[PDB]
Amino acid sequence: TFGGVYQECTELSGDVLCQNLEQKNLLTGDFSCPPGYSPVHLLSQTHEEGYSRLECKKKCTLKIFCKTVCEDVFRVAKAEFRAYWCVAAGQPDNSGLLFGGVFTDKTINPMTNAQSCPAGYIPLNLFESLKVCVSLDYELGFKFSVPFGGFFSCIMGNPLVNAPSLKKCPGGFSQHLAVISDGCQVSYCVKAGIFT
């Protein structure tokens, strides 16, 4: 079962960037997993954004000679985001989240053949631009849902494959690339054959 995703954020350059990066877990209201689920660290990265401002300053040589020089000063704003997903550490079986596919600002969600979530699904923000479609209404949301077999990234394996984590999809699941974040692959597992 799939327990949701979350993404923490930390400001390392005294700025304001986390507003877009952090994402709380639906089921807990916090950056944590529900009871019976364990966090699986997908990725840790530093998001950088260039901010250039022009500044003029008065410089005086000996106090009698006043000269105003105008330089634009370039600065970089940095914040670290840490993206995790929640996996069933044990086994309440009637819990978790339904999976309705993922997409980015540049890719499409094959479930809808558009950059959107299925009807009645919530997009959860992950990384810089990834969206994970999730529903909690089983009887209404199940119609648009596909079985989910886990995530794995270039730095963390998929704990659902059956010791360390292996970057593979389990059983009858196939791997599909979710996003490339700063040169690191992040893919997900769904049922084999569903996508065409």
Residue numbers in the entry: 377 to 467, 469 to 539, 548 to 581
Study authors write:
Perforin-2 (PFN2) has recently been identified as a novel and critically important component of innate immunity conserved throughout the animal kingdom and evolutionarily close to the last common ancestor of the MAC and perforin-1 (7, 10). Because of the presence of a canonical MAC-perforin (MACPF) domain, PFN2 has been proposed to form functional pores in bacterial membranes, leading to bacterial death and control of infection. However, unlike MAC components and perforin-1, PFN2 is initially synthesized as a type I transmembrane protein and found associated with the membranes of intracellular vesicles in which its large ectodomain (consisting mainly of the MACPF domain and a unique P2 domain characteristic of PFN2) projects into the lumen.
We determined structures of the P2 domain in isolation by x-ray crystallography in two crystal forms, with two crystallographically distinct copies in space group P21 at 2.05 Å and eight copies in space group P1 at 3.17 Å. The P2 domain helps to stabilize the pre-pore state by swapping between monomers and enables PFN2 to bind its targeted membrane.
